[PDB]
Design a protein around this ligand. Structure first.
Ligand code: O64
Length: 217
């Protein structure tokens, strides 16, 4: 495998989004993974509707909108629904709303998803290198995560209990300190202009490899 990967270089990553006061990280993580696949399949880079997931991938999928949800069950919604709308057609409002999906604004489909085995950072590396960005959960329940500005993030109090959905868009090392390149949805002023580099091959740090998944179109 390559020593480093950055899917932004390959035209497969959209602008960083801002979730605001709504806990829709799971929805942003899901759409980000699918956006990359859509680019690979069709050649178009298009922001997909996180709001569509918040509003429509709800109780039937075990999700709770602005109170949290699962990337995997979001993918299954898109499969079952035979589509997800563009962000442009179904923009983000940072609140729970009635489902407004319309197939006339469909921007992508999903045929399946794959959940990687628990805790295996080598398998996660392979998927990022060979398949695309991968949706993951991390333990973000520590002040240092909120305060993060730059460099490789390591939090000695981190656990493998994940609570925040993000997107692994690459990996590498900073003067030998290995990291995962993570796209967050806390806007362009969080961390490294919306990104955080999290410790890699440090014992599944913050549960980054606990629950990884990726969709296919
Ligand atoms: C982040 O915006 C929201 C805040 C409620 N967090 C989640 O949706 C969430 C909560 C528990 C576990 C997960 C997991 F495992 F899917 F990552 C998530 Cl995304």
């Amino acid at each position: 495998l390559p020593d480093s990967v950055d899917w932004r270089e390959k035209g497969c990553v959209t602008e960083v989004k801002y979730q605001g006061s709504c806990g829709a990280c799971w929805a942003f993580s899901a759409v980000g993974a699918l956006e990359a696949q859509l680019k690979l399949k069709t050649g178009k880079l298009v922001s997909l509707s996180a709001q569509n997931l918040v509003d429509c991938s709800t109780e039937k999928y075990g999700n709770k909108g602005c109170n949290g949800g699962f990337m995997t069950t979001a993918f299954q919604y898109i499969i079952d629904n035979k589509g997800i709308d563009s962000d442009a057609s179904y923009p983000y409002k940072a609140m729970d709303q009635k489902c407004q999906y319309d197939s006339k604004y469909r921007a992508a489909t999903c045929s399946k998803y794959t959940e990687l085995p628990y805790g295996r950072e080598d398998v996660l590396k392979e998927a990022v290198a060979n398949k695309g960005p991968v949706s993951v959960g991390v333990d973000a329940r520590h002040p240092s995560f909120f305060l993060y500005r730059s460099g490789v993030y390591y939090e000695p109090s981190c656990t493998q209990n994940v609570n925040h959905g993000v997107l692994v868009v690459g990996y590498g090392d900073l003067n030998g300190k290995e990291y995962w390149l993570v796209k967050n949805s806390w806007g362009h002023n969080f961390g490294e202009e919306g990104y955080i580099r999290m410790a890699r091959n440090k014992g599944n740090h913050c549960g980054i490899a606990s629950f990884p998944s990726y969709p296919e179109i």
